Nucleic acid binder design. Sequence first.
RNA 1: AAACUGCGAAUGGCUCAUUAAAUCAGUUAUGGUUCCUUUGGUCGCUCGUACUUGGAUAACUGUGGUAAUUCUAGAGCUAAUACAUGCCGACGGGCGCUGACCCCCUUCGCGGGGGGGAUGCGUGCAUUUAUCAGUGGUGACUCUAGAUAACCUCGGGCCGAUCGCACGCCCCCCGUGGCGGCGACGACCCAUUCGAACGUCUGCCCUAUCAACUUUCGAUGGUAGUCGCCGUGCCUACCAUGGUGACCACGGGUGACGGGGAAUCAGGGUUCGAUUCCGGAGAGGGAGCCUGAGAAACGGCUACCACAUCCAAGGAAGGCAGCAGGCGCGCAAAUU
RNA 2: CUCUCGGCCGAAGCGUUUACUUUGAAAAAA
Lengths: 30, 205, 100, 151, 262
Amino acid sequence: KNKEEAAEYAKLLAKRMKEAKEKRQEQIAK
Amino acid sequence: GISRDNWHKRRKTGGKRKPYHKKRKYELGRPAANTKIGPRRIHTVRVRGGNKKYRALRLDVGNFSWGSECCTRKTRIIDVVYNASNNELVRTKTLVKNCIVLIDSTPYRQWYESHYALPLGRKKGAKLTPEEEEILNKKRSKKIQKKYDERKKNAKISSLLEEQFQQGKLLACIASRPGQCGRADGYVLEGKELEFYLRKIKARK
Amino acid sequence: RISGGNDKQGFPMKQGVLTHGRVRLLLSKGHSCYRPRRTGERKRKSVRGCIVDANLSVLNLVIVKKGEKDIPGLTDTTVPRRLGPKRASRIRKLFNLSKE
Amino acid sequence: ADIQTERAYQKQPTIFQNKKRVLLGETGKEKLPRYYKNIGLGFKTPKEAIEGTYIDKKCPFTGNVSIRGRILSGVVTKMKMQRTIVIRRDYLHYIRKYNRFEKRHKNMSVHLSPCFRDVQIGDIVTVGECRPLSKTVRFNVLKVTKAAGTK
Amino acid sequence: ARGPKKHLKRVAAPKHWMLDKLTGVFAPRPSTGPHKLRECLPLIIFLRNRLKYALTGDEVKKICMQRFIKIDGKVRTDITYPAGFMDVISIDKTGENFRLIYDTKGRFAVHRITPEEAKYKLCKVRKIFVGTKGIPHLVTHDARTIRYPDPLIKVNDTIQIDLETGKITDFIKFDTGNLCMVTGGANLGRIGVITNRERHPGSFDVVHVKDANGNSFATRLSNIFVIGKGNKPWISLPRGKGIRLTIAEERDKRLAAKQSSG
RNA sequence: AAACUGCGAAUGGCUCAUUAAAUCAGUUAUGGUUCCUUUGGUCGCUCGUACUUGGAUAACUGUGGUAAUUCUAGAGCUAAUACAUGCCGACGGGCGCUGACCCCCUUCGCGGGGGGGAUGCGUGCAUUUAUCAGUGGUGACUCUAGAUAACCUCGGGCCGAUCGCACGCCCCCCGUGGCGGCGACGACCCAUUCGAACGUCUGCCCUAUCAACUUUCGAUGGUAGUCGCCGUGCCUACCAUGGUGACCACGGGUGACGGGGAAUCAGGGUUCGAUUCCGGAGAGGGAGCCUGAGAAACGGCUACCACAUCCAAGGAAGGCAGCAGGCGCGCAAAUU
RNA sequence: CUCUCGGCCGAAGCGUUUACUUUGAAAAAA
Ligand SMILES: [Mg+2]
Ligand SMILES: [Mg+2]
Ligand SMILES: [Mg+2]
Ligand SMILES: [Mg+2]
Ligand SMILES: [Mg+2]
Ligand SMILES: [Mg+2]
Ligand SMILES: [Mg+2]
Ligand SMILES: [Mg+2]
Ligand SMILES: [Mg+2]
Ligand SMILES: [Mg+2]
Ligand SMILES: [Mg+2]
Ligand SMILES: [Mg+2]
Ligand SMILES: [Mg+2]
Ligand SMILES: [Mg+2]
Ligand SMILES: [Mg+2]
Ligand SMILES: [Mg+2]
Ligand SMILES: [Mg+2]
Ligand SMILES: [Mg+2]
Ligand SMILES: [Mg+2]
Ligand SMILES: [Mg+2]
Ligand SMILES: [Mg+2]
Ligand SMILES: [Mg+2]
Ligand SMILES: [Mg+2]
Ligand SMILES: [Mg+2]
Ligand SMILES: [Mg+2]
Ligand SMILES: [Mg+2]
Ligand SMILES: [Mg+2]
Ligand SMILES: [Mg+2]
Ligand SMILES: [Mg+2]
Ligand SMILES: [Mg+2]
Ligand SMILES: [Mg+2]
Ligand SMILES: [Mg+2]
Ligand SMILES: [Mg+2]
Ligand SMILES: [Mg+2]
Ligand SMILES: [Mg+2]
Ligand SMILES: [Mg+2]
């Protein structure tokens, strides 16, 4: 359970950080 | 027994107040733990909530930290020299928080000689033992000698600490409360604070 | 061997007290001559000293070494049966059993 | 020197002033970094607190206290204790039977930080609530405004 | 007193239990649990006073000891168990499901739901904190602690929990324009749309809500529970849609119902 | 059955003696503490006989003492989720420092670099101290989380030697056979629930034939400590001379427990509230404690003061302001 | 009410501050 939850949250956190950085990049570029 | 309540005190105006209830369990107090210097002796106290308080009655060692070098080591406690709150504590050699004590310097000297590979605390007579000679004059390769020579750039200590190392004893200040946690922990005095406490000790004599 | 006894008022003898007469002690759990009724209860009880004197109603004795003959009431009787060990390790120790 | 007036050494607990450095950086200036914090609620930190050298553990800006509770106001009446003053709060109490009011007052002992200087008797002070600092002190001075007669 | 109190006087019980005065001296003191004593509904009160299944307290115990009642999918045998807001009660013997939702009068209502809906619940995020090894933790209004939540979820938001696994499926953010219900105060049981939020540093925040009919009111921030996004709730609503009627129009509705009866 | 173990007995019930910014009521705070239990989260995260370890004690069987008690003494047996002691496994490694040696570039060469590395020490969560950098949150942390050097109490933190019900799948196999489902109990630490405890602002009846009070023995504030579950003259040492008061301080009285409320009342108001709900206090008067998460507990203990029971005079045992009931008191109040 | 910065509104300063009045919230049951 610990391993599975850690892996799933790692994937979710990567997705969230990528989304936030992409939106910030779009705001800066415009 | 010993009560530390607030309703036995006079009012702000100065008039006295009549109590409306007797002494309660949660307002109790306990006799002081006069911690001396000697072989370790600690008694546990059952406190409110079922927890424990370690009531140290005798202590002789503790871990102190050299902050500038960030070197924490376990060293024995030798004597008590100064106490800001009361000088009677110095006479009876009582270990309390913020008291100034003397500790041994050997582990700090060992770490310093193993790190910078320079003499420290040695007499000018240059007498040596082969173990210390191979600790200081060991055969190292080019890469390791390069790191040691670079470390030798920052190897410098104030005259006060060097004199204390020559004496074999350092001045330290205790930061933990021995009567509450059962251990005497602190830090080595250095800098302006060391000068202040040296002046206080000299003026006391 | 001197186990214990009772003086002429019926009070028992305690090992610790070293006197010829009675004393009053505050007894708690783990003490002989007392049995608490509540958790943490203590009570003041009168206890006779350990020193043997002439003012004793009864004195207790335990035979440790046997003599030439055997008392007709004490020794010649056959030993009675008793409960056997209940823990497995004590069974093995009594009967010298191996693990197999 | 001037700061060190007690038998014990007066230090700011959260600042480490024994950090070793090269001999070139020692010659420049022996300027200890000051510890201060923003207390919130729109109150600004006085410049004397940031640039000062005083030591006060009960100061709302450079000490170990927390401001939470009620924010009150008063007029300075007495300045004779060490780092603490006495202010007076005036109000009117309503009597239902006569449909009128009566004048009443209260006295408060509050802690005054060394950052606030040039405080005279008769000027307005805004204080905030904190944990009990002594037997009778529960408030700390947050702002000082001068009297109407200031020139 | 010298310690915790174990009794509850009947007249000192919460008034939304609708207990009568002459039945007895005591009232069932709720056990410690997910919900507060003043904001819960004991199992016995719901089981004998609301549903009329049992007549005495003994029959409630006889029902409970047969392991028939489930709260949030778990069997509870305690007859004073504190059941609170947005909880699911299942009786498989009769095949019934209920959800505890306040009515417009500020009382818990007997609200039957589809067994498909009984698989999830809504929770309000109460606390967000990072624990050992840098693991985020989320604490809800019903004492549930969930590890590794979505990084976008903050306090005062709503999360949907699947009762079987106890894991977040999705969430609703606390923003103006969403649907909310009041869980305490004078406006308890009312449903509306958030209009604006007033921030008072060092004090309580005030939030304004407007219902479907256009009536406006305000509450504290702690008394608001976000139900759905926009105008669409994520749960089924009771008979009243959350609109509080005045006494005059309640009388008018009652008279109209009486006239049409017969 | 009995006895050991566990839990409760700190709730409830009674009374209003004390108590005049005290209690209490409304309003805030704990970013200054503790918290049985319920609910949820963690519980191979530590690299260092286990196919189950040890000694006793009751109940029981026998022998007894005292005028007397819910007094107990000796002897013979036997258990644990009582009392103790202690492994394996995961365990392959990973990461921080020490680092003999081995290579790869530039250099004529020194020298300037980039890697690999055997051998040693440390390692997880809690505890104490020092230092460094700045995931998530607050109006505000000396917050949470991270890193580094150590420490870690023998009156000793955790890391399961416990119980029940259904019992099945797998192997070169018939074994040391391997695996597996629901629960019960226990436990270090977070969160929650029930609280408790200290604080903020405002508010109380008569009395000046009570006008100055407090500070030797803490009264007001500062510094460092002790004690305490925490904040604080709570206490200690060294210091400053402070603090309150006609807006009534201080003292005295109250046939004064405080409110939600009650009687009378055009509108104002006057009087009452021991009494079933919410807080407080007490168990003949004081004081000191054990156990426990929680008591300065009294249908717990230990003393003194006042009463008072049995006695074989050596001793033993007491607390109805709990329900009935009895004496006394009174104008004044019910069934052992 | 006021410039600025962000999406007419949003943030921030408001008000020299109160007293008063009118709202709103929190306010045990009996
Ligand atoms: Mg009293
Ligand atoms: Mg009038
Ligand atoms: Mg009671
Ligand atoms: Mg209950
Ligand atoms: Mg028992
Ligand atoms: Mg108990
Ligand atoms: Mg009764
Ligand atoms: Mg109050
Ligand atoms: Mg605290
Ligand atoms: Mg708990
Ligand atoms: Mg025996
Ligand atoms: Mg045990
Ligand atoms: Mg930290
Ligand atoms: Mg202090
Ligand atoms: Mg002080
Ligand atoms: Mg009265
Ligand atoms: Mg009275
Ligand atoms: Mg009238
Ligand atoms: Mg009239
Ligand atoms: Mg009343
Ligand atoms: Mg009353
Ligand atoms: Mg009376
Ligand atoms: Mg009491
Ligand atoms: Mg009584
Ligand atoms: Mg009496
Ligand atoms: Mg008594
Ligand atoms: Mg207990
Ligand atoms: Mg008592
Ligand atoms: Mg009684
Ligand atoms: Mg009682
Ligand atoms: Mg009676
Ligand atoms: Mg009786
Ligand atoms: Mg009558
Ligand atoms: Mg009569
Ligand atoms: Mg009310
Ligand atoms: Mg009411």
